[PDB]
PDB file of C-alpha atoms in Angstrom:
ATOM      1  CA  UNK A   1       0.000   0.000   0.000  1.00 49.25           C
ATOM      2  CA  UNK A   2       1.017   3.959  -1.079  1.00 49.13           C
ATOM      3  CA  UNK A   3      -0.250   6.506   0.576  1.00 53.00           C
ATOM      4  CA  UNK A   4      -0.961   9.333  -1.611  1.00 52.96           C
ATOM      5  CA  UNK A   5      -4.114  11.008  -2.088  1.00 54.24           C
ATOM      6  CA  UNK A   6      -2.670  11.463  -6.276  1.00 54.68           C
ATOM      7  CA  UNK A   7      -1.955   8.211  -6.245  1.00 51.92           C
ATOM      8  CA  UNK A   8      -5.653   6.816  -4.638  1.00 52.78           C
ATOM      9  CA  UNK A   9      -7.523   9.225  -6.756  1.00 51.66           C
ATOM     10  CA  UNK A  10      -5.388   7.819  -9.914  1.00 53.29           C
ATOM     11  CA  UNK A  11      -5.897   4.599  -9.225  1.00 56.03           C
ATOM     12  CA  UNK A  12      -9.411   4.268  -8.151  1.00 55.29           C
ATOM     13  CA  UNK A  13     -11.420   4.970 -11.563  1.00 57.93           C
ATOM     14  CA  UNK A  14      -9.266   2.058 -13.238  1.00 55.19           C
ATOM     15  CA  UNK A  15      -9.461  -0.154 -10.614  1.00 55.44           C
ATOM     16  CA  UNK A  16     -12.900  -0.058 -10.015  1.00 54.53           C
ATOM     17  CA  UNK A  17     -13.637  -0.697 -13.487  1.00 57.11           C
ATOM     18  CA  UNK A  18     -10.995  -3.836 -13.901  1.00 62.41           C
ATOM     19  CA  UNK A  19     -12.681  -5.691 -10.941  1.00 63.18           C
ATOM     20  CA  UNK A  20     -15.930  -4.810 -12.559  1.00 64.61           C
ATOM     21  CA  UNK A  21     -15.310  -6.743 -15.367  1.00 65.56           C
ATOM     22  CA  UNK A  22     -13.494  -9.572 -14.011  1.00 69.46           C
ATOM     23  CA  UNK A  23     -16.271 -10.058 -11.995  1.00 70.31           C
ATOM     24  CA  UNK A  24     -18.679 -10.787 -14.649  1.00 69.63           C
ATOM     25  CA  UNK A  25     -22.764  -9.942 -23.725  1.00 67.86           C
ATOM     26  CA  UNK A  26     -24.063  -6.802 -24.580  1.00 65.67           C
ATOM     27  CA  UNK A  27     -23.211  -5.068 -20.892  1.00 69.11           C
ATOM     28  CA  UNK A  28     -19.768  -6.985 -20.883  1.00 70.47           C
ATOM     29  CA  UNK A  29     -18.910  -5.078 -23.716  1.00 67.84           C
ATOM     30  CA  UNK A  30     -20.474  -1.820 -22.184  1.00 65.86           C
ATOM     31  CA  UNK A  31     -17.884  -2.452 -18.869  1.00 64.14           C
ATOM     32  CA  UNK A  32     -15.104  -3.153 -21.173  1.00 60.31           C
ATOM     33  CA  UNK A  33     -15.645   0.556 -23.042  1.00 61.38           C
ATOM     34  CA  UNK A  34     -15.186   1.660 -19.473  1.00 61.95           C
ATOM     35  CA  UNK A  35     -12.331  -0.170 -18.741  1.00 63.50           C
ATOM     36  CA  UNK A  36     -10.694   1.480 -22.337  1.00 64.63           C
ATOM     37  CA  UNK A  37     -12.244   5.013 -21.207  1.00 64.69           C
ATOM     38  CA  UNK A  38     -10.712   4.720 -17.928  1.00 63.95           C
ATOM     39  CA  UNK A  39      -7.554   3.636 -19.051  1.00 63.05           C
ATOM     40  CA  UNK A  40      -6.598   6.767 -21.848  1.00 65.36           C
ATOM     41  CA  UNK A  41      -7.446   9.059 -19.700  1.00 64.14           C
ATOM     42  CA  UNK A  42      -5.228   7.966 -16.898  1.00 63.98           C
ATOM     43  CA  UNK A  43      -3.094   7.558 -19.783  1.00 63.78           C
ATOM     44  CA  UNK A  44      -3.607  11.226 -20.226  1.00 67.18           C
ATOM     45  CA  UNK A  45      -2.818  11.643 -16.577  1.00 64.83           C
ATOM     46  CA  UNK A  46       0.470   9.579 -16.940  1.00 63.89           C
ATOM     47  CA  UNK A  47       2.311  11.371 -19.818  1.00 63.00           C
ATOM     48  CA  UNK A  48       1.188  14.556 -17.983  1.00 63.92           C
ATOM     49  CA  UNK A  49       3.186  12.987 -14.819  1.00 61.66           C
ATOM     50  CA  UNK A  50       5.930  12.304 -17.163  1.00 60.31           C
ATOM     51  CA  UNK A  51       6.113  15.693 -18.681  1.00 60.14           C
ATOM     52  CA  UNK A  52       6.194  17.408 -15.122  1.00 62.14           C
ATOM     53  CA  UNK A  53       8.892  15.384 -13.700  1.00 65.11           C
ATOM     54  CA  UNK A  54      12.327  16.613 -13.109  1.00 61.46           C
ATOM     55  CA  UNK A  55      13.802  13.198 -11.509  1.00 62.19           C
ATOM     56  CA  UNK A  56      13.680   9.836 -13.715  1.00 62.76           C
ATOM     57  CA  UNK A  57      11.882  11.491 -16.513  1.00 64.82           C
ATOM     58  CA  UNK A  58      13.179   8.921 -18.567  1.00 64.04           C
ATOM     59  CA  UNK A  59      11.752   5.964 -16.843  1.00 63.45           C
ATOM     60  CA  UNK A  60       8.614   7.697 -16.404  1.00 62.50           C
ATOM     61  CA  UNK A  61       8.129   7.940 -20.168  1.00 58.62           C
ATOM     62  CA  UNK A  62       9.409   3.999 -20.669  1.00 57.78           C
ATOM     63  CA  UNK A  63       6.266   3.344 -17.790  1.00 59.10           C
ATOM     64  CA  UNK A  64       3.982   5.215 -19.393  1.00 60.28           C
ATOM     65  CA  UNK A  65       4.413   3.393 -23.007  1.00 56.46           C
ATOM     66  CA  UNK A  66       4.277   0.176 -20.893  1.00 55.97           C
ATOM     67  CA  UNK A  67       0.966   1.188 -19.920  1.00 57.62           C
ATOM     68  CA  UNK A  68      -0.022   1.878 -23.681  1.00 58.19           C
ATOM     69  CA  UNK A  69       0.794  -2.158 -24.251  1.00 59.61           C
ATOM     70  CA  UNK A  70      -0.746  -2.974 -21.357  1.00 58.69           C
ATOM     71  CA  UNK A  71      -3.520  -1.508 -22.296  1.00 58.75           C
ATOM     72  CA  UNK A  72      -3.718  -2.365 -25.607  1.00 58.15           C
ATOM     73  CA  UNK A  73      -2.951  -5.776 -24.862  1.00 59.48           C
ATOM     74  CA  UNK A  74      -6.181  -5.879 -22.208  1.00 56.93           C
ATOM     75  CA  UNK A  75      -8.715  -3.837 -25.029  1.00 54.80           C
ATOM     76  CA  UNK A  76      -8.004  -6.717 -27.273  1.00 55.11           C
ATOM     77  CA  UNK A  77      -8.512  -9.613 -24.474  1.00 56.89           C
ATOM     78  CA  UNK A  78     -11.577  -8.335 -23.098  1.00 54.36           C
ATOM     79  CA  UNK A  79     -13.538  -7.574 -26.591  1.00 55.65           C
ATOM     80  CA  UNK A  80     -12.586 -10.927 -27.221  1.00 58.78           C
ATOM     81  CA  UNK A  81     -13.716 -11.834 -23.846  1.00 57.58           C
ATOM     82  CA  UNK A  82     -16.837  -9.697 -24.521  1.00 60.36           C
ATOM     83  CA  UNK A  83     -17.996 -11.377 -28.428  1.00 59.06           C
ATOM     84  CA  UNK A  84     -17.849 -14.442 -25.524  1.00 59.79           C
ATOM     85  CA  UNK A  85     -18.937 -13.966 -22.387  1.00 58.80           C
ATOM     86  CA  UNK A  86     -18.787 -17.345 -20.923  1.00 60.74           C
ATOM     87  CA  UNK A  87     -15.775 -18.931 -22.438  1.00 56.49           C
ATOM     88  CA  UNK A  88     -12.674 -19.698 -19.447  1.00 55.89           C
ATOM     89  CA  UNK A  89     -10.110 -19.860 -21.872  1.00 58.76           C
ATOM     90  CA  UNK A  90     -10.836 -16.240 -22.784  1.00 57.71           C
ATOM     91  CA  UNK A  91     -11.758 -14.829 -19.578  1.00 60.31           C
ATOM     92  CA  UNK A  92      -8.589 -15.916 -18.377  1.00 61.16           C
ATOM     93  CA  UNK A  93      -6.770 -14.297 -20.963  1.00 62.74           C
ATOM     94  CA  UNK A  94      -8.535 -11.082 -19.748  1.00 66.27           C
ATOM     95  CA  UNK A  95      -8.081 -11.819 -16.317  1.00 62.76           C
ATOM     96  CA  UNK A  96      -3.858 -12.004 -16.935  1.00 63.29           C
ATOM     97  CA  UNK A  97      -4.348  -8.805 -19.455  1.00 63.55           C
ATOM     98  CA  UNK A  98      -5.649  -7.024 -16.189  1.00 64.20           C
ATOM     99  CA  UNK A  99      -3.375  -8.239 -13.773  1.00 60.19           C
ATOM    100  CA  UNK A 100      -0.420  -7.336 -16.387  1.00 61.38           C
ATOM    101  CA  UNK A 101      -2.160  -3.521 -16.788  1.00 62.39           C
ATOM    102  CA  UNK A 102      -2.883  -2.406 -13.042  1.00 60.01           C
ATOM    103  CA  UNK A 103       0.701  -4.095 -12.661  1.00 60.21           C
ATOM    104  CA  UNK A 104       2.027  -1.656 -15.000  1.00 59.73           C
ATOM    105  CA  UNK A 105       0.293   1.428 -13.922  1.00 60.15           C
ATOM    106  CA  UNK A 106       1.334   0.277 -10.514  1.00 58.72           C
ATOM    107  CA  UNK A 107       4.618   0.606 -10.993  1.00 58.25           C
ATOM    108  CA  UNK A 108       4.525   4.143 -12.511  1.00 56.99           C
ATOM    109  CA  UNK A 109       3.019   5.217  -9.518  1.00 56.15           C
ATOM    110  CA  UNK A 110       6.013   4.124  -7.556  1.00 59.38           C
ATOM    111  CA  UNK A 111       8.312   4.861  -9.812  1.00 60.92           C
ATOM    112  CA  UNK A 112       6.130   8.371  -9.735  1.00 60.16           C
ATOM    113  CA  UNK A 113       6.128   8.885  -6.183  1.00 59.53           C
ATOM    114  CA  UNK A 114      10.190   8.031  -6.023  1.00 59.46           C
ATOM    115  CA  UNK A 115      10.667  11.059  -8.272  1.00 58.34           C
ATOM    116  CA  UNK A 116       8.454  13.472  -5.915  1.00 60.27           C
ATOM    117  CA  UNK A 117      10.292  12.037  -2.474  1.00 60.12           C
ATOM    118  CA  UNK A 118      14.222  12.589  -4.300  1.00 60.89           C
ATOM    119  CA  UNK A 119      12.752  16.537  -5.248  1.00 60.84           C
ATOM    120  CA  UNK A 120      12.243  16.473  -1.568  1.00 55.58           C
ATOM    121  CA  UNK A 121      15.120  15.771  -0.392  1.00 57.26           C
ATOM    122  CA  UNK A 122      17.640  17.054  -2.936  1.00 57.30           C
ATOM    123  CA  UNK A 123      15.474  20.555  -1.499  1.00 57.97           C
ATOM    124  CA  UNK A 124      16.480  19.266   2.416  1.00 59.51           C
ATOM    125  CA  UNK A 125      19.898  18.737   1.553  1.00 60.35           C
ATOM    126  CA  UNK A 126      20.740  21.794  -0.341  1.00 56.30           C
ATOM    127  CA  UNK A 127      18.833  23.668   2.488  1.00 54.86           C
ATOM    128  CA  UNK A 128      20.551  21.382   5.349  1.00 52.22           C
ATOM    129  CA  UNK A 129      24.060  22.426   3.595  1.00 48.03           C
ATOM    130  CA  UNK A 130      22.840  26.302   3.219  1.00 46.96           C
ATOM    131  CA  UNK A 131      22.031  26.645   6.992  1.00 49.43           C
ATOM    132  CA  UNK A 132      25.488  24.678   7.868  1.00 47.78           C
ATOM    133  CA  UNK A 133      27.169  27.365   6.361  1.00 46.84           C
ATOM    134  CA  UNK A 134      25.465  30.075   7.901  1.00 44.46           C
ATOM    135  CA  UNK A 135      26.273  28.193  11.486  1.00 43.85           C
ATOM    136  CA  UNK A 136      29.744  28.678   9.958  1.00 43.83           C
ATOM    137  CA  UNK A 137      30.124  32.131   9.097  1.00 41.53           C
ATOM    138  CA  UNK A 138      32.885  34.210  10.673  1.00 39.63           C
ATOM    139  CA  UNK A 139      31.444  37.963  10.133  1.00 40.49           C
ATOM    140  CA  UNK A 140      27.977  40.070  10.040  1.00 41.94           C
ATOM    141  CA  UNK A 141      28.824  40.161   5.784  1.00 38.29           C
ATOM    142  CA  UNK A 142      29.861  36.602   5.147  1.00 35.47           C
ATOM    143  CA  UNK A 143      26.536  35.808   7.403  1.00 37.36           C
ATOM    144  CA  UNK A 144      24.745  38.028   5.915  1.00 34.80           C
ATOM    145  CA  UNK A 145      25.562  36.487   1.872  1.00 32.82           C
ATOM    146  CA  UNK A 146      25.190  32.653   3.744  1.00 35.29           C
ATOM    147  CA  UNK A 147      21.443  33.508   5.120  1.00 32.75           C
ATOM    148  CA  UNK A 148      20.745  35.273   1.365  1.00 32.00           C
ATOM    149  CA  UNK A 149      21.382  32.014  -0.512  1.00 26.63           C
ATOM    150  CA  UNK A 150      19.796  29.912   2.314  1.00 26.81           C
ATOM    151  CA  UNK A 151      16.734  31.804   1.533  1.00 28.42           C
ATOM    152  CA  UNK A 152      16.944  31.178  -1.950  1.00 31.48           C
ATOM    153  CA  UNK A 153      17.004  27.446  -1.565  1.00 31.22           C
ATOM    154  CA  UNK A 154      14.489  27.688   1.345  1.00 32.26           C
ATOM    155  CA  UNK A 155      11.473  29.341  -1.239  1.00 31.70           C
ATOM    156  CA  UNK A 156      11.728  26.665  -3.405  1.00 29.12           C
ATOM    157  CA  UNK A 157      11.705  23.875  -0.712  1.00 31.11           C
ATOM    158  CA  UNK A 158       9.062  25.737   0.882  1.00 30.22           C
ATOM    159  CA  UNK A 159       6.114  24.860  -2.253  1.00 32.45           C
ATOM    160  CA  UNK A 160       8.012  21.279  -2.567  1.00 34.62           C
ATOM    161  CA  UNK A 161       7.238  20.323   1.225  1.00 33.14           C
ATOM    162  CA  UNK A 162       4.474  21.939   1.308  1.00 30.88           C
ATOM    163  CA  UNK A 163       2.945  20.084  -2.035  1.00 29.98           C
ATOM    164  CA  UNK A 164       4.009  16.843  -0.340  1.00 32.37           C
ATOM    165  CA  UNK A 165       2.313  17.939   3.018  1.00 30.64           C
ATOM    166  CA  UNK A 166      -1.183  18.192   0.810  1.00 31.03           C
ATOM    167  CA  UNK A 167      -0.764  14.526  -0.556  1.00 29.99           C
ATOM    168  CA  UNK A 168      -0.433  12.387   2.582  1.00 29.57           C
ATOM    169  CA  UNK A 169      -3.563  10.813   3.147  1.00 28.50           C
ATOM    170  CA  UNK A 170      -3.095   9.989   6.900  1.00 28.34           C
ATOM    171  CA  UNK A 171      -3.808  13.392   9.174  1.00 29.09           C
ATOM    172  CA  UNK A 172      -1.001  11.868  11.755  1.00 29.23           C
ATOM    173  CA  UNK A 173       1.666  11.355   9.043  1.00 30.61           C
ATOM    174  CA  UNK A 174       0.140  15.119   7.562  1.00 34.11           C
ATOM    175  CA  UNK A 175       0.181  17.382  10.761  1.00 34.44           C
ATOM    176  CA  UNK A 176       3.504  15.886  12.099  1.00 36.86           C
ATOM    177  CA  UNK A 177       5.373  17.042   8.489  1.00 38.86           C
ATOM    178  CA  UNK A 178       3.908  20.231   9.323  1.00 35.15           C
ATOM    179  CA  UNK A 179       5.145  20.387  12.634  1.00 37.09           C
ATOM    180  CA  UNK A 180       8.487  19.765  10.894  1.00 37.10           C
ATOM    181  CA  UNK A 181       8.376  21.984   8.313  1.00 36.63           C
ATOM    182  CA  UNK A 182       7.407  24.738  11.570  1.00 33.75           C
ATOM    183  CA  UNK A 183      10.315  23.502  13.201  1.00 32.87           C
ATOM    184  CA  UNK A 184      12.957  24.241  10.102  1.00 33.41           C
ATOM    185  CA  UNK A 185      11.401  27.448   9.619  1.00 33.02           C
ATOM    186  CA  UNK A 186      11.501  28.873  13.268  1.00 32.75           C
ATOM    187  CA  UNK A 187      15.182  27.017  13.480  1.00 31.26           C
ATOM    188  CA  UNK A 188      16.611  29.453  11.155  1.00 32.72           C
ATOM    189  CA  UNK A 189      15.521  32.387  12.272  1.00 31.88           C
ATOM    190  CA  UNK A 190      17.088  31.415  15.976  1.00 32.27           C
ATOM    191  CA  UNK A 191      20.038  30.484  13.884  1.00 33.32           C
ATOM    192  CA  UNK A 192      20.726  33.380  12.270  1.00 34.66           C
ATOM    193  CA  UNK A 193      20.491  35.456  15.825  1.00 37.02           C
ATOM    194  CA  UNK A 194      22.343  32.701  17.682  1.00 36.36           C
ATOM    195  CA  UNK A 195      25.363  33.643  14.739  1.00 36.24           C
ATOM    196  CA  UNK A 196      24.866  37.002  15.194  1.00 32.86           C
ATOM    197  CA  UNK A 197      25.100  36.586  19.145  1.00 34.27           C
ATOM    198  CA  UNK A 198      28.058  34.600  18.656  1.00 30.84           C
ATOM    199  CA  UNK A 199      29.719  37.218  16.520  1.00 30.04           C
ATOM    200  CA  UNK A 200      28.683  39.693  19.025  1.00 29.78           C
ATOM    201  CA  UNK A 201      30.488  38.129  21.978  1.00 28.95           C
ATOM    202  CA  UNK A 202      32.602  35.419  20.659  1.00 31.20           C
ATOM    203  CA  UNK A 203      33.947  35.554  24.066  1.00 35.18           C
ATOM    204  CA  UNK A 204      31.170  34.083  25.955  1.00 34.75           C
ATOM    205  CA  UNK A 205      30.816  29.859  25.683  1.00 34.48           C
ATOM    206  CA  UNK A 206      27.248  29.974  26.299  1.00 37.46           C
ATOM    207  CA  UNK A 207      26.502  31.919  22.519  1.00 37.87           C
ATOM    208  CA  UNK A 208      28.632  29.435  20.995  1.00 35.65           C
ATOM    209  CA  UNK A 209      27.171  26.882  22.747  1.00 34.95           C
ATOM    210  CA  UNK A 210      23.333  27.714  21.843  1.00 36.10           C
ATOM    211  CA  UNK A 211      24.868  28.524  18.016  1.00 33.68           C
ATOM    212  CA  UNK A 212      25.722  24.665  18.139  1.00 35.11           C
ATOM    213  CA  UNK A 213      22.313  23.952  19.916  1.00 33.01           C
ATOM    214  CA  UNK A 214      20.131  25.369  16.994  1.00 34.04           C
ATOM    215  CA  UNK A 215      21.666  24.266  14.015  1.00 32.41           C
ATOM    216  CA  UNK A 216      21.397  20.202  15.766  1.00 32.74           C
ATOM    217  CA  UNK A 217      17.970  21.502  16.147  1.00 32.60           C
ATOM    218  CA  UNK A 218      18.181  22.148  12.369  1.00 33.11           C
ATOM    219  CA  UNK A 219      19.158  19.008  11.289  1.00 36.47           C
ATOM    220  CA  UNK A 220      16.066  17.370  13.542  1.00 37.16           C
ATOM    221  CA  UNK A 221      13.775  19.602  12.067  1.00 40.25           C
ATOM    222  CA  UNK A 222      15.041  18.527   8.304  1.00 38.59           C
ATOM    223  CA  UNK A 223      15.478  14.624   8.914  1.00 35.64           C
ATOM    224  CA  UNK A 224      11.951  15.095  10.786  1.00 34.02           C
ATOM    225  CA  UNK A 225      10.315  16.577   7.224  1.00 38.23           C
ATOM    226  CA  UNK A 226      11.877  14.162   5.066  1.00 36.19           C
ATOM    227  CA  UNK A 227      10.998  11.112   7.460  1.00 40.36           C
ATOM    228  CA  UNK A 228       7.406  12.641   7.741  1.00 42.15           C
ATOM    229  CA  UNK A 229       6.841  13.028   3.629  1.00 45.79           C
ATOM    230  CA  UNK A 230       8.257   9.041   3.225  1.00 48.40           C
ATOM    231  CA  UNK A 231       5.523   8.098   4.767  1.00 47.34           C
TER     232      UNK A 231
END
């Protein structure tokens, strides 16, 4: 089982419709025009996927064409199965056609979801690495350029996480990646003024202490987000 509310809402129309069918002349043929309706249009759905997708575009489009033969492969088997409702031999033709399709669609999904979850995280790691080096800056200036170029990274992490946030379909696994995402946000704010502090009194071991504090609270926030959006 995936958890994704894209994924579920995907899945659903052509599922539905497949079990339909395997579970049962002139109305066969009616369920399998739904099952071929059903099927282009997440077909429509898929290529979309594939257009959109920055990570393992490739293998996206090799899935989706899969599902094309797949598909093709079950039309065939279940108008054939349809012209003869009652034959064995040709419903279970169908029946491995089907199995073979919501096998392939299946595993663009994954595949799908993979590419959405590595976005993710290449965002937490460039972010993770930004916010290292402003925990690492020596002056206000150098800071000052570090937290400018954290921010940069941050925006587009921000719509990425929060994306994410609006697909899990479990409210536990949804409000706790919020919490996290919270968490990274108010983290580097209280880094940046536990640098600043730091630069301010460089003498005193309790600013370099709570500099040190914040960013570990940093890297819980992060591993927290990308543990929450796996599921």
């Amino acid at each position: 089982e995936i958890r994704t509310l894209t994924v579920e809402r995907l899945l659903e129309p052509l599922v539905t419709q497949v079990t339909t069918l395997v579970n049962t002349s002139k109305k066969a043929h009616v369920l399998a025009a739904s099952v071929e309706q059903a099927t282009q249009n997440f077909l429509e759905k898929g290529e979309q996927i594939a257009k959109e997708s920055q990570d393992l575009k490739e293998e996206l489009v090799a899935a989706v064409e899969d599902v094309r033969k797949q598909g093709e492969t079950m039309r065939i088997a279940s108008s054939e199965f349809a012209d003869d409702p009652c034959s064995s031999v040709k419903r279970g033709t169908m029946v491995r056609a089907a199995r073979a399709l919501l096998s392939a669609v299946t595993r663009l999904l994954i595949l799908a979801d993979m590419a959405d979850v590595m976005r993710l995280l290449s965002h937490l790691k460039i972010v993770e690495e930004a916010l290292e080096a402003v925990k690492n800056a020596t002056n206000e200036q150098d800071l000052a350029n570090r937290f400018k170029e954290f921010g940069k990274e941050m925006v587009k992490l921000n719509y990425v996480a929060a994306r994410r946030q609006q697909e899990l379909k479990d409210p536990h696994c949804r409000d706790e990646m919020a919490a996290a995402r919270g968490a990274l946000k108010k983290n580097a704010t209280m880094l940046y003024t536990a640098s600043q502090a730091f630069l301010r009194h460089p003498d005193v071991a309790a600013t370099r202490a709570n500099r040190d504090y914040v960013f570990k609270q940093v890297q819980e926030a992060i591993a927290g987000i990308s543990s929450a959006a796996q599921a």
